[model samples]
Target: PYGPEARAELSSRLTTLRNTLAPATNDPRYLQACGGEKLNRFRDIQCRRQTAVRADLNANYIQVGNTRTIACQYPLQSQLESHFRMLAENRTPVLAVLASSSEIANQRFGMPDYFRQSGTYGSITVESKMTQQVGLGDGIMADMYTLTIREAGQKTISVPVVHVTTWPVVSSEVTKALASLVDQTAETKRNMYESKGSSAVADDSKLRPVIHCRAGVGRTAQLIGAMCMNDSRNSQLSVEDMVSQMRVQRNGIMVQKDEQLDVLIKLAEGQGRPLLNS
Candidate 1:
């Protein structure tokens, strides 16, 4: 059963399920995460690793899932300046969704604090609140932080970091709601860039959002899939196809649980409506 034919059959089944379950939104540029000519700085960022972090925990750009054109990043616990440099140098706007708890499996975490410290982003300040409610309940909400980054004798760049609050790693209760929020947030930001005369935000590497969780798989993949479907970027692609693409670019266990896949399917079907009145 583990032969070539079996693998092909499983792949076909997955693609079929994705197409059957996910509906299109009549978009012409769908599934075009990496389109148009490449940028020099962007090429410099490809497959780059930070030397400061642990070898096993170093962060790098995924080969697939539109990482080449999209701004989706997977960073490890390292110097806050490194993260700032990466985001600033590429001129990319990132929306980081933290799906794991601050402390997971009895270990202290630093990702949240790492971003919260305004010093890293260079004269950072809380710009504004995109959503009011903090924790996961009625809907997903995130706070926008504005910061200025500068290199010696170089022009300064301002980047906004949209940080989501308290999303559970393995809970389906708020998955749909959070997914909607993520999609909405990205759209709003993309619109801002469009207003600035930027062409096709989704296809632009500078406008892509960098999402992450504990392992950069599992929950991270689920959040990404939901975002794609919500924004109709998957209009030509299926949930399974998108997830499979993510795994092909990153890890095999991108969609780790059946329940996560179920939620993604529900998102594509336009089911899991947000609990706004709660």
Candidate 2:
């Protein structure tokens, strides 16, 4: 069941996860006071065409084991600039860009590349400092860019932008990019702590990366799951269980496809951990 032929079972599990929450009311913010006000919720994302809930919850802060991260959809370039600024203001160090070059997926995708050069968008200065490591299919590492963001009268933030630009949605080939992406984020976070001095960071953490893509459900969650698979506590949980834990916070729209879960399982196995009845 753990091998390549496990595709069928994995697909069924993904379909069943749609019923994880009630169709009408499943967003976690609803249970809290004022219902979605303080939640930093937004609905400008491309959700899946299936039966999952929380259609309005596009951007969410989720926890995978003790690792803190947010999974959000990078919307159209027009609205996309604002998302960049929010992270800029928060001093978010790493914003993983999992978007596609194609623009044919669900009225999404095909977003104009914002980090190509450097310009001011909505009063946020995105100065492209450097671009290293190119050709997704040719190189083991994805394209890494050092972007310096300057919001007037605030600290100039250097955000390491990592992109797997080869695929719109990841395939088996994406496994090649996953390890480098993880390491790049970790390396950047460590450098920040050392370079910025031991004085302080934030309660939100300079390490809190925003793992985002087109849908914000499939590939984004898959990457975050990859990080969680490295966690000892999360690695002990079955593929179904770990995703379910994420669903509680993200409102059950995570790990959107069979391929995604398979990779997570692949990642888990790679870490030398056995899960479930596999």
Candidate 3:
């Protein structure tokens, strides 16, 4: 279920983490645990709900002001149907941020295509896809897709998915792409509400986007943490505190790497905002 590239990248990342935590040493008293077989031990560390692959609707809410953030591992087709049912029943709007792919650099992560998978009888279908390129030559690009999900035998739901390429890890480009998608979704919801001549659909739950990555801990937490810090209402909280609270809600494994925490701090300091002249 994985390609050589994914295996290599994941192995390299774990090796780097081991080196950072405990560099090589020969002296028994000063010997590092991460020098040999323990180098890949971080991968074996259990998350709060590691085996619960489907999204946890209850434990995945990070509230900042009126908005609630939900983070989880990539969902299966069944779970996606369940999510659509929940959204329809609650009459809430949703924007899904897919930070990784079942192919490419994360195939080993075991994420299925909730929106598009060939040979699956009831899988969601891709209606359209749009390419978004910033023209910066930094090799960053995103594919924005509109997917049609048929659920409950008669209801069909259209979901917007933005998959940023190059395997971004909390970079400025990634943050901007996420923010832009959220804003676009919000604007569309606002227009729909206006057209219906009702404020009934306006709510905090609808304002938040459901975000997820491979483990729903590393990349996902980094993205959500940055958004929480960027929100004006949450400006009073420190980045560390923001991440702490996120873990309290999304599970203890949120923000797994020190580099992710650093990204959150940088976002809190207003460093990852989109470049004006780029």
Candidate 4:
């Protein structure tokens, strides 16, 4: 879970909500894209400045203040070093990469393995090995990878990585995997906490873990909503509550496809559905 009460739904009076916000034009990143070479994986999915990843980069956090999950895009090859640097600077311990192997392997508009070999990219050095990866939508412990990320002036940090392969459709298998992914994320946090050193108490505010796909607005949003529904801090909050927080934080497109919405409903356990096809 994000926190003790983090996942609990806000059990107040609001009945329903949905995100229809457009990417604000005033955001400098948007303006930057408009000016010249586009930023991010997609033209429309712009990141908000206020909650951007702060090594002077932009990866949107779904909620504000002391958050664990930061929904983001897989940066372009040019910014890969900077992206990992942001994670290192913030002591981010876990990264859930939702991009599938085929998509990443396509390398058309995505990123190549920065840590494939001689993995030194300017200010950062990353070396990753397949920690585990066999289950593939059938079991709870399916598809996990490990990485060791290092920054020039900082100590090498071994980060736990849980990579979820392609999520092009919503299925019972995908729902089971999503539920387990939430559990896996929680486990990764605890593992990293203990690894941080016993004398130092953990503060989630200082630790930020990220999840990203190609665009990060759709697949990313689906997972955030799923986690919110599963580990809800307040049980009564409809799935829309999580949707609203993400909409407000991201301030751009979120859960763009209805098929993506289906994943949330499946994992929701009837909380959002109420009746079939809700």
Candidate 5:
């Protein structure tokens, strides 16, 4: 009886919110889409109780003064709710960041509407798995996906977070989307700087990018390794270092083969003579 009542309330609220938002037509199950998969749903709740998607924390955090700041990975809705509460309470968002691969669960929950309305919260949907391919909307499941965080807050805490993502799932027509994504990321960073004042962090900022795959290794680690090799400021970072960072954040970080890492290395080299050499 208690369970029934709670389910009834949750259902009613979901319907009301769905109707109120006027979610994308032709797909009424938007509330159901963002519900997330079992793993994510579990992890989203678990993180608040003191857990993380990845076990490694070294690569994802930025050191500020004496403190080590970490970027969190969680379900978008939950993160939104949690952070909003944190912001209201703390009056200072120690880190203003967002990251996620929009699975079907996010869609069922009407994430598109919520994220668009979320002010500083921007989202990127990538086709990393078959479930996402089948569940997410048409325009959303793109081959190469990216989100360039344009502006956030002002003064001291400017450009506080750099959200990043790379998809391993392939469409019939796309390949090396990460290469293009990296270039666009660089361009967007440049444009944001030009538009905002040079004095702003958006100008001289290096993104604190977070990379994630469905399981947290394989393609995700490779992408981060590739990016680090591509950027001169990060050229000093070796693949071992990248993998080590990932491993520390995520227990099993290097799931892909050395061949995959090699390809990423070549790809990064093709990116240019490195950021500094240029």
Candidate 6:
């Protein structure tokens, strides 16, 4: 008959009533909108927004699950050319190009295939489904780059090169492009791994397999450094650590600033199996 016990039980019943009223109390009266069961899915993406810990992590990165491919960090056009040569010598088959940078593409004075003869890369027609179905991506440059490499890899084990106007540069639009690059990279890797020792056309593989972008510096750097870090079994490589490693080997490395390094960190964390319940 303690007075405190009676108060506690009364409080508990109120808590139960509050829980029962939660769903309907906040239900929207208008056309179906941001409430109800669908709201729960958004909770994960949104809860973090309210919580201080995840608030700052507005951009969520997705892991594409790529393997059977390796990367290198490069600094400039010259460095990319050098990498191409090295891959050729190793019979690795070098494929290099700029990505979908509107600024760079527009300045170049041509459509997706308008690489200056001085530029040393070939051009392909993007933006058509029949064109893209053979490879990857959306729109002009994205389409051309993706499909070209897909076909090249199939024709020969020589690694495919995907050139964009200016890949891996940091910006909102660049982030979307980078994410697409990551997806395509995974697809390329998946295809190569599956096509291992065989191709639809039956072109025989001649050399080791590798994937490299523009300079092998920025995007290439992040991808490779991430791979290296992942290989070391260190699931998440801090931005500082990734930058540090990329800089040392790449010399003129600028991948930290070039890629969605922040997003990459999240994706790598998600790579760990067994989702946690909190």
lDDT to native, each model: 0.48, 0.60, 0.49, 0.59, 0.34, 0.34
For residues 1-278, write the lDDT of model 6, one tens digit per residue: 21355335533443443343233323331112222222121221121111111112111111112222333322233233333343433333323343345643454432223222213433211121222312223432443222222123323223344444444323433434444554455456546645765433232322323434433434554544444434435444343444443332223223434134444444444454211111
| 1-278 per-residue lDDT for model 5 (tens digits) | 12345335533443343244332333231112233333233221112112231222212332212212232333344354343332222222122112244542356543332222224443322111111121222232333222222223522222212222223432212224443354344446545655756443332123333333333345544554554554446544433344444444333324245445455444544553221110
**Comparing 1 and 4 on TM-score, the stronger one:** 4
Number of clashes in every candidate structure?
A: 0, 1, 0, 7, 21, 12
16-54 in candidate 1: lDDT tens per residue? 544443323432212212334221112212222221111
TM-score of 6: 0.37
Worst 10 residues of 1 by lDDT: 39-48
Best by TM-score: 4
Candidate 2 positional error at 210, Å: 1.5
TM-score of each: 0.59, 0.73, 0.62, 0.77, 0.40, 0.37
What's model 1's overall lDDT? 0.48
Worst 10 residues of 2 by lDDT: 44-53
Model 4 pairs whose backbones collide: 7-232, 7-233, 8-232, 8-233, 8-234, 9-233, 9-234
- Model 4 scores what on Cα lDDT? 0.59
By TM-score, how accurate is candidate 1? 0.59
Q: Could you arrange the candidates by TM-score from highest to lowest?
A: 4, 2, 3, 1, 5, 6
Question: In model 6, where do residues sit more than 4 Å from their true spots?
Answer: 1-84, 90-141, 144-158, 165-215, 225-241, 256-261, 265-278
Per-residue lDDT, model 1, residue 22, is 38
Error of 2 at 123 (Å): 2.4
Over 1-278, each residue of candidate 2 has an lDDT whose tens digit, in order, gives 46655545655665576565433433433332135332222342222223222233345667766667766666445554566655664456577777654432335334556765787777777877557655545343456777787777877767777776545435434654574565467567656766967333545544567777766777778878776665555545566666765666565567767667777777766665554435
Task: Rank the candidate models, highest lDDT first.
Answer: 2, 4, 3, 1, 6, 5
Cα lDDT of candidate 3 equals 0.49
| lDDT (Cα, tens digit) per residue for candidate 4, span 68-187 | 478777777767777777666555656777777677788565576653333777867788777666464544334565667877567876666777665556564565556466556656
